Every structure is written in structure tokens, then in C-alpha cells.
Amino acid sequence: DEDETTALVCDNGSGLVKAGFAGDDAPRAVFPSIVGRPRHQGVMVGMGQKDSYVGDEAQSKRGILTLKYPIEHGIITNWDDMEKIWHHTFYNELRVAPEEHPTLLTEAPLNPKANREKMTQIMFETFNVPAMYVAIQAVLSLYASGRTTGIVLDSGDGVTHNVPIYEGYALPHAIMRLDLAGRDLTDYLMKILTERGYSFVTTAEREIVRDIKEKLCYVALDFENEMATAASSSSLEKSYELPDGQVITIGNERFRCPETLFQPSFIGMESAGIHETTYNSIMKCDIDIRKDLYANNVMSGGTTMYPGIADRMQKEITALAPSTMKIKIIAPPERKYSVWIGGSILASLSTFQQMWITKQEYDEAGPSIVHR
């Protein structure tokens, strides 16, 4: 129990932090990855002067603060502001004292060696956690779907990745990163919806375009004769009621937004798209392992939640793969937390105890120890 209860799992994202206790089924804490700094001197009624704001209080009060994102494209870019988000996570969100809890953290696919050593330096030397561990994100997603070999298409708020994993070892030279994700996707909907003849003028109009994207957006299979369908004008249309009455209608654009993930050309991106990239990762891997990867395309991440994403991907890679092959696109329902759940499982596991980096290992080996 000492640490069976006690292991923490913190998944640091570009848009959201997911956090909680190893053992739980889902994150106890989910909140924006921002750190707000007040543009002016003054106070809220009853509070003192605050130097900084994090998560939802930074989002809610955004009009008087300069908002900053510590993690650009999955990589920690500002370490002063990240230690601020961690502090908030332990002390306010989970309300635990960190110096008696083992902490499993996550990093990104080709996270620079030096960063994995730096967050270890900050975990052990400024938070004084007993022990910690850094798992790679795609690797926890895979594992949370039971398996050990597969290829994960991972897509969240600032990055998309393909991480081919074989008997647990993520394959460095076959990993692909596509910098277009849910953030890019909300801003494109924004324009095709203002372009439908609308105005997201106040900040209460801006924010909810993102809630339109999440609730009403679709990834149609045969996106071709779906536009064609749009035109005959079926009961395909969908009206959402705004903060007030102002019933906005979205028929068609509803799927023009996730067609951006297959066609980056919709947004002036010259890069290849999700399905081709799944494939290219795969023809960059060893030959003998390619049947395995093909029957185990595990999807994780908030942006892979658009319904019919899996069917489109299913047919997208069948038709690029040699017919002798078995294609299989696994997309679980909890996928917006796969990464986290894979960490919860792993860290609560009976056999993981012997991989925890302890302060004994650290004080004796330097940050190098956990770096592997």
C-alpha cells in the first residue's frame, strides 16, 4: 500500500495535463496546460496579489493575464513555467505532498535525452519525490490496449505521431511526427464556420467553436460522396444552440474539419496525412515485423475521437497495404486517456516496483540513471 495507493501518474500534454493515482480508472485531474501572468497590478475581491495563475484559473481570467504554453508540440519548452504546472498538480489539484509519493511521468516520442534528465533533476531535487519513472506516451497507450507490438497513431492538442513499438521498444528510426492536431483543427473549423456566414466575435463565441468540433464533428468514410450528399441536402445538417438562443447551423463543415487530418492541403500544409504517414512508418520498419504493425494500429489521443476515424483509416491503409496483409485499426472508447490509463496499470503493477528510479539511485548516479 506504501506505494500501491501512493503512485502518481502525470501525463503532461500540449493542451491538457491528465493526473491522478495509479490504480484509478481515469485521471483525477484534467486541466489546461497554461500559466497566466497578470498584465496589470490589482486584486480579486478577498484575495491577495497573485503572481501567477495555472490551469483553469488562467483560462477563466485570460483577459488580464499573458497566457503561456510550457509544452510546445509535446516537448517542454519552458522549465520555469512547467515546474509551476507540476506544483499546481501536486499541491492543489491532487492535494498530495509529493515527498511521499512515487511519480510516473510521461514524455514524448523523440524527447531529447537532456530533457528526460532535466525533469528528473526537478522531480528529485526541487519536489523531493521518493522515486519516479518517465514512460514514452505511445508506449503506454499500446500497453493499455493489452499489447506490446503494434503502431500507435497518437494525436492530441499540438502533435501527431506514429510510434511503431516491438516487444515494448519504440522504434526510433520509424517514428513520424506531424505538427497538426486538435488545436489546428479548432481554428480551421472556426474559419469554415465564419465562412458559412458567421461571427465568433466575443470570447464566449471563440471558446465554444471547440465544443462544436468535439460534439458535432465527424470523419466520414467516402468524404467524396459526402460533399455530394451535402448538396442534395439531406437531413445531414446539425444545429447547435449557443451560450444564448442564437441557434447556429452546421451541416456540411461538420466533416470538412477532420478531412483536414487526411488532407493537410485544406490548411496550407504540404506534409502527408495521417494514413499515409501510418503507412510510411510501416515501410520504414523491418520487413518481418510489418504484418504485426498492420494488424495493430492502436489509436490514442483527443483528436482521434472524431467518430468514423477508424473506418476511414481502416480503408485508407487496406488500400495502400499489399492484399496479402491483415489490416486492424484498434480505437478504444477511453482513448482520450489511453496514455494515462497505460501508466496507471503499469505503475500499479506488481512487477514495476523494480524499475522505479529511487533517490538512492539518483543521489548516487546523477540524472543519467533514469535517462537509460
Partner: protein, 55 residues
């Protein structure tokens, strides 16, 4: 595959129904509290309009 989808959505629709049922009971209860807090101020009223028409 049709399955993972039908089940995951059944679970989301059930989570949303329990959420909305919880919000309906709080508003309906905040309610008889409001509806009653009034009979009192509207009745304190026919009274507190009658004595100044009298004085």
C-alpha cells in the same frame, strides 16, 4: 468494430443522462425553495401595502 462504437456511445449517453438527471433534481429542489421563499414576501406584501394606504 460496430460494437466498440455502440457500447462506448451507450456509456457516454448513460453518463450524460445521469449528469442531466442530477442537474434536474438540483434545479427542481432549488425550486420549491424559491416558490416558497416567495409566498412569504408576496403575503408580507398585501400587508405592507395595506397599512400605508391606511395611514
Amino acid at each position: 468494430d460496430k460494437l466498440k462504437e455502440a457500447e462506448t456511445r451507450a456509456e457516454f449517453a448513460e453518463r450524460s443522462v445521469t449528469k442531466l438527471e442530477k442537474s434536474i433534481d438540483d434545479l427542481e429542489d432549488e425550486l420549491y425553495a424559491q416558490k416558497l421563499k416567495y409566498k412569504a414576501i408576496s403575503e408580507e406584501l398585501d400587508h405592507a401595502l395595506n397599512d400605508m394606504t391606511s395611514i
